[PDB]
Design a binder for this molecule. Structure first.
Ligand code: CAR
Length: 221
């Protein structure tokens, strides 16, 4: 059977993570954090001294990238070539390099085959920026989760806050907008809602109010 897929795209800080796992737990499907794949790529590009600023060098690393994701059971596990990197892939040096890579056209293509392998029966819940417009433009369900930068920033400042880290708001906002821009305006697989994607807005919708509206969207079809 040709495995069904539901795509969740949108900016950083809209709630694609908790959505994505609330949907893969209730539907009983696999999940794809492809965002965790551009982050690991960069991490391998650091630990391997691979000039992250090199298209010709990033490409080999990307197409050979030895990443893995546990079928889990209650939490997620990001394992690079054999070891959990789940804490390391969320630091400053990485989330930077991550968008310092995704930007590479030839690198997005070298990463195209691994991601799509994430589609299997009973289905697949894909997360990212270009999932419903790139990797899975044939998706029978496409959701675009959006917000406001100010709000989505206000969310990163409390998350960074819930672990005891210095967070000034008036700086992170500009970074959000810093990150957003490069994503909404880069030459390949930019951040932009597929013509058939449901632009869902989570700026004032509770987590419950989001999974409920999306679960209801995927569900008729
Ligand atoms: N589908 C995706 C997911 C992430 N990315 C890229 O990877 C970076 C880190 O992803 P994330 O923080 O969402 O895990 C983003 O800055 C950038 O958009 C992408 O290009 N396409």
């Amino acid at each position: 059977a040709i495995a069904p897929v539901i795509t969740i795209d949108g900016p950083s800080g809209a709630g694609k993570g908790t959505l994505c796992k609330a949907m893969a737990e209730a539907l009983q499907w696999h999940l794809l954090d492809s965002g965790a794949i551009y982050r690991v790529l960069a991490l391998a590009a650091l630990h391997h001294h691979v000039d992250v600023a090199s298209e010709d060098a990033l490409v080999p690393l990307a197409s050979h990238l030895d990443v893995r994701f546990v079928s889990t059971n209650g939490n997620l596990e990001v394992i690079l070539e054999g070891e959990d990197v789940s804490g390391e892939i969320r630091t400053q040096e990485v989330a930077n390099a991550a968008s310092q890579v995704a930007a590479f056209p030839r690198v997005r293509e070298a990463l195209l085959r691994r991601q799509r392998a994430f589609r299997e029966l009973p289905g697949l819940i894909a997360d990212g920026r270009d999932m419903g417009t790139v990797v899975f433009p044939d998706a029978p369900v496409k959701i675009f989760l959006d917000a406001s930068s100010e709000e989505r920033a206000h969310r990163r400042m409390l998350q960074l806050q819930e672990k005891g880290f210095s967070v000034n708001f008036e700086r992170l906002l500009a970074e959000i907008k810093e990150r957003d821009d490069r994503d909404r305006n880069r030459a390949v697989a930019p951040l932009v809602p597929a013509a058939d994607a449901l632009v869902l807005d989570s700026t004032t919708l509770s987590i419950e109010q989001v999974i409920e509206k999306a679960l209801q969207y995927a569900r008729q079809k």
